[PDB]
C-alpha cells in the first residue's frame, strides 16, 4: 500500500521532465533499425547455410560405425 503509492508518486516527478518530445523525434528519426545478427544465407532465398567458426568448430567430435 505504501510502496505502490510512493513508487507512483516518484514516477510522477521523474516522468515530468522538460521537453519530453524532442527525444521522441530523436528516436524515431532513426527509422533505420538497430543492426541485426549476421548469418550466412543463400542469395536467392536467404535460408541459412552452415558455418565453420573456430570457437564452435573446436568442440565437435564425430566417429565412424559399420552399416547394417
Amino acid at each position: 500500500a505504501v510502496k505502490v503509492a510512493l513508487g507512483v508518486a516518484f514516477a510522477f516527478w521523474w516522468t515530468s521532465g522538460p521537453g519530453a518530445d524532442e527525444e521522441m523525434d530523436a528516436k524515431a528519426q532513426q527509422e533505420p533499425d538497430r543492426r541485426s545478427q549476421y548469418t550466412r544465407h543463400y542469395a536467392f532465398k536467404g535460408r541459412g547455410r552452415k558455418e565453420f567458426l573456430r570457437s564452435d568448430m573446436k568442440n565437435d567430435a564425430n566417429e565412424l560405425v559399420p552399416t547394417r
Binding site: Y38, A43, F52, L53, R54, M57, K58, N62, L64, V65
Partner: peptide
C-alpha cells in the same frame, strides 16, 4: 556488401577426420 560480409566473418576452422572408436 553481401560478398564482403560473406568473405569476412571471423577466424575459421575446417573439417577433419573422424575415427572408428
Amino acid at each position: 556488401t553481401f560478398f564482403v560480409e560473406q568473405m569476412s566473418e571471423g577466424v575459421l576452422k575446417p573439417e577433419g577426420w573422424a575415427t572408428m572408436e
